[PDB]
Design a protein around this ligand. Structure first.
Ligand SMILES: CC(C)CCC[C@@H](C)[C@H]1CC[C@H]2[C@@H]3CC=C4C[C@@H](O)CC[C@]4(C)[C@H]3CC[C@]12C
Ligand SMILES: [Pb+2]
Ligand SMILES: [Pb+2]
Length: 436
């Protein structure tokens, strides 16, 4: 049918009624074919680096060229600050990819495929037009199905820029049909010997009643550096304080201590993350410069091998039949192909439970950061980067919503675990079957 008839269709009405009895698992919703996306959530990890030049820029900034590299502030006080500005620009650049990609390729936000345990998604940005960049690799793996958790790493060996992180969400519907989404997890970016800890923001999906969903960010995101510098990004927009669609305000401070006083901000960046934003230094409101304009530089999609060469666990290969059925809009075929894959997985899980076997994660392992960790679990090293950055930010190390600070209600939750997925580069180095 035409999108104009989605909202009043029997299919959408039945979907909205299934929401009324939402059991907590989005996979139990009767989402009609027209609102389904043929893309699995394991693919979303690629949204962290669709602007290769911005991802790598911090590695090119040094003591001898930092002022010359900093266009937004040729008077930047230090290379560390120049790099924080670059990392902030990169983070902002990821937002359009993360939260707007489906609206552009599918017509609206849609329900993504719920990955199966063990699903993989790999590719690379060859950066052919820039030999100084080198190849940047993406490894994404579904480390959990119940609940869904995607772990990932994006790395550029040539310039020593590596990123790793994981993501999980907890979603619920309000009485007005707003889908509230709390993200869990975090991402760490290492630029040579300098590190940055990034926390994703909470968000909500609106437009469900009218059958034209879209993401609206809220809350805050943090970027804590090993240099002490901290960037606090606040999201607002329509229906909220600002009233401006996809708006944000980011402030950079000398340290988390100073972030308690907005007047201490070294820079203030404001605008729309899906559009243009300006930057003001200190408090010189008078003078401002363009910080980032999302419309000027198109996202660069990574290179993925042809389907004919993909391994059975690779996302697109595994979901091929379902993706095809979704593109056709065939109600019965979608149910048939999806059930086929998910039932095979059920059988696998039942065999594992009864046979005393556990699925072994491929390139990531779950580290227990608890004071009293599971006896067989891997534990963090003394010089663990997350521990040091979380300490600097006064961030909770528990499995609380992303960005939860020590002392917050979510951190004082009784018997909350502290398990975090970590990339194990050695496992990729000794990978003997998967290739790029
Ligand atoms: C779309 C309606 C009808 C059904 C529900 C769709 C929900 C499950 C979808 C739509 C928007 C999706 C989010 C879009 C973007 C991101 C950022 C990525 O880094 C992690 C996954 C995450 C957080 C997705 C989680 C799943 C999500 C919230
Ligand atoms: Pb709104
Ligand atoms: Pb384990």
């Amino acid at each position: 049918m035409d999108p104009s008839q989605y909202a009043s269709s029997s299919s959408w009405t039945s979907f909205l009624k299934s929401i009324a009895s939402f059991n907590g698992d989005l996979s139990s919703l009767s989402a009609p074919p027209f609102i389904l996306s043929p893309i699995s959530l394991t693919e979303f990890s690629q949204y962290w680096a669709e602007h290769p030049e911005l991802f790598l820029e911090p590695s090119f900034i040094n003591d001898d060229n930092y002022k010359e590299h900093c266009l937004i502030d040729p008077e930047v006080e230090s290379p560390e600050l120049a790099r924080m500005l670059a990392v902030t620009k990169w983070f902002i650049s990821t937002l359009k990819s993360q939260y707007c990609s489906r609206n552009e390729s599918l017509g609206s936000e849609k329900k993504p495929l719920n990955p199966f345990l063990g699903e993989l998604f790999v590719g690379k940005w060859e950066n052919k037009e820039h030999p100084e960049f080198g190849e940047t690799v993406l490894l994404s793996e579904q480390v959990s199905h119940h609940p869904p958790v995607t772990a990932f790493s994006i790395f550029n060996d040539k310039n020593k820029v590596k990123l790793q992180g994981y993501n999980q969400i907890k979603a619920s519907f309000t009485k007005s049909l707003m889908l509230t989404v709390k993200q869990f997890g975090h991402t760490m970016l290492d630029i040579k010997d300098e590190s940055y800890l990034v926390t994703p923001p909470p968000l909500h999906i609106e437009g469900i009643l009218v059958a034209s969903p879209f993401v609206e960010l809220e809350g805050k995101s943090y970027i804590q550096s090993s240099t002490g510098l901290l960037c606090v990004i606040e999201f607002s927009g329509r229906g909220y304080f600002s009233g401006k669609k996809n708006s944000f305000k980011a402030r950079i401070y000398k340290d988390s201590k100073d972030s308690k006083d907005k007047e201490k901000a070294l820079y203030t960046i404001s605008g729309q993350w899906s559009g243009s934003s300006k930057i003001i230094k200190a408090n010189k409101k008078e003078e401002s410069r363009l910080f980032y304009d999302a419309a000027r530089i198109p996202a660069e999609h990574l290179n993925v091998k042809p389907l004919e060469e993909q391994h059975p666990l690779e996302s697109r290969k595994a979901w091929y039949d379902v993706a095809g059925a979704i593109k056709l809009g065939d109600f019965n075929l979608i149910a048939k192909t999806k059930t086929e894959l998910e039932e095979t997985q059920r059988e696998l899980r039942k065999e594992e439970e009864a046979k005393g076997i556990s699925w072994q994660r491929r390139w990531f392992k779950d580290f227990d950061y608890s004071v009293t960790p599971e006896e067989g679990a891997l534990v963090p090293e003394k010089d663990d980067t997350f521990l040091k950055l979380a300490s600097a930010l006064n961030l909770s190390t528990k499995n609380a919503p992303s960005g939860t600070l020590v002392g917050d209600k979510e951190d004082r939750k009784e018997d909350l675990s502290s398990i975090h997925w970590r990339f194990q580069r050695e496992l990729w180095d000794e990978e003997k079957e998967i290739v790029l």
